[PDB]
Amino acid sequence: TAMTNAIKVFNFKPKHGIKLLIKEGFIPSDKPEDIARFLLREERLDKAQIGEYLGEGDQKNVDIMHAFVDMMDFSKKRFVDALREFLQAFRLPGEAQKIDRFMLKFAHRYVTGNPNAFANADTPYVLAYSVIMLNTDLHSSKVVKRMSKAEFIKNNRGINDNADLPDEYLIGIYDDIASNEIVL
């Protein structure tokens, strides 16, 4: 019979919305685990706003976004599909620092869930920037020049402990990018 209007507070004021939301309803404790649980599980909250809040540089926010990234699972899943799942839970902000903070933990979670896919956790990170750049480039008609496969492979040369990734992996990633656009 209440709490329905509590969601709308976060949609414009993130810190105010959270600091008002905790005292009633869900979230028994201010610990990052519970707030991440509610943030992923509950809809009707702005994806861009939660992306901005989780990507914030505050230590508590960064712990909460650790919890949120860990809560999703990418074990025994393709890198492209894992990235799509990662981006399908929130809308990433436009700040370079926030994207970096998100995508670092994305790569770390993918490695700790799907080991032996890449030699070091730096490789999924670099591949994640490369694939997001290719997604932005391919599905945008704002540029007449077209991004091809050979140029993409050349751009992704020696990104796995200065050793080239398998060509078929990149071909599959390119085909998945061409299939559809990663959308919020």
Binding site: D100, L104, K105, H108, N120, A121, D122, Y125, V126
Partner: protein, 321 residues
Amino acid sequence: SDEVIKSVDRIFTNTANLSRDAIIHFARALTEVSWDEIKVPRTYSLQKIVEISYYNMTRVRFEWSHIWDVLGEHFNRVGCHANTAIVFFALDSLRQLSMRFMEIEELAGFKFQKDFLKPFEHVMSNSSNVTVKDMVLRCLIQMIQARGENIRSGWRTMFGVFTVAARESIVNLAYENVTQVYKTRFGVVISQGAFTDLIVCLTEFSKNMRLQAMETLKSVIPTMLKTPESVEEGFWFPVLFAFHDRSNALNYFFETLLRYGFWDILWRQQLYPIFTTMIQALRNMITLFTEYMLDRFLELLALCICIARIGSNCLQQLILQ
């Protein structure tokens, strides 16, 4: 001049706002001018490189790695320089910059600190000077004492420095510090996937001849295996690769063969000891029986040996046993 100095300071203070393709060129230009200055002997350019490195700690991580791909190269060039004072200044400032770096909160599984500390390994493996290596060890150990708790994913190259400093004192100090680290932060070392590097460093101390060798012989297998209640197989691999490759460690390999007395992969490296003193090793190999699939290849190994006369005299006895 007030305005000129303000402008020259703001040029470097504005480095954090440059784009990637621009900051890379800035780094390369500063590297080139710094090398030009060092070759002729001021270090103002080096000081500015250090200041830029301080200003770019907060930069996006992959852009920072690309920047370090040239800054660390310049630091390697400076470390190999023949001027003791300049190398000491560069290493001291790299120590300070590393203490600043470690607070970056690197996630486990990454390799940023490992790549950032690479210049120390390069200086250790590419400098011919006892005092330079001693300074590198001293700064690394000051790092251990000061910001050891934050060392995450940076232990790989930072034991690489120790295991490269296993050659001549330098070795005494290096072994003492490795022993302290192993006996104080073993959980941390194994947590960040540095177990293999720790084992390699210890077995490189052991493999090194010319007292400390005996101490690390007793501190590599005996005191380690008791602590963990690829940890075991990746332990026995370096034991093989260094113990049997003087006579004291050679035999101690054979007397440690029997301590433990998965099997397929362990057998794959079991050929190498066989294919001198290896007679005792082969006797221990048969004693290892303390299983059917082993018999497909153990007789093959036994017959492979048939110096030759005594080898076959051992062959007959071992086949009988």
